[PDB]
Amino acid sequence: PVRSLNCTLRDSQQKSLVMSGPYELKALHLQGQDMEQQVVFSMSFVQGEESNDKIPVALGLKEKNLYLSCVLKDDKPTLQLESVDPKNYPKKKMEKRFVFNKIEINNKLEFESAQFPNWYISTSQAENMPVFLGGTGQDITDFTMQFVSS
């Protein structure tokens, strides 16, 4: 059965990720009690081409049938949160739209869409803006991961 880890992510400006309605995430500076708003991910280690510093993963919300995915929307590569059938997920052979290449860069991580080369999970420098898929340099594409208890 597919292996997964609970974790949080923060961008390189130490912004945490929170829900923004049902199908979007946003990034903001949180500390103290307000950190509890952050989203916990279940990162699954899925099928795909890999190397030492590039590992295919899927990013689901912990104990929710919701996954980050990359699709064309109005003809542009876009990040979305997508609902799935909870009987069938997670699985090792995730569909390509759900796969990200987790890449080590210096002491940080980037998450490249496997479907759209050189498009990355990104945040803006401004507070309270959506997490999005970026093809680029003001926008932030590097993150750190924090491990969470099972």
As to burial, measured by CB atoms within 10 angstroms (0-12 exposed, 13-18 middle, 19+ buried), residue 26 is buried
d(Cα 92, Cα 65) in Å, to the nearest integer? 15
d(Cα 17, Cα 27) in Å, to the nearest integer? 5
Resolution (A): 1.2
As to burial, measured by CB atoms within 10 angstroms (0-12 exposed, 13-18 middle, 19+ buried), residue 16 is buried
Give the residue from 91, 90, 114 showing the smallest Cα distance to 101. 114
1-149, which class in CATH?
Answer: mainly beta
Backbone angles phi, psi at 35, to 5 degrees: -65, -30
Angle among Cα 143, 75, 102 to the nearest 5 degrees reads: 20
**Domain segments of the chain as ranges:** 1-149
Computed on alpha carbons and rounded to an integer, the radius of gyration of the chain in Å comes to: 14
- SS3 state of residue 96: helix
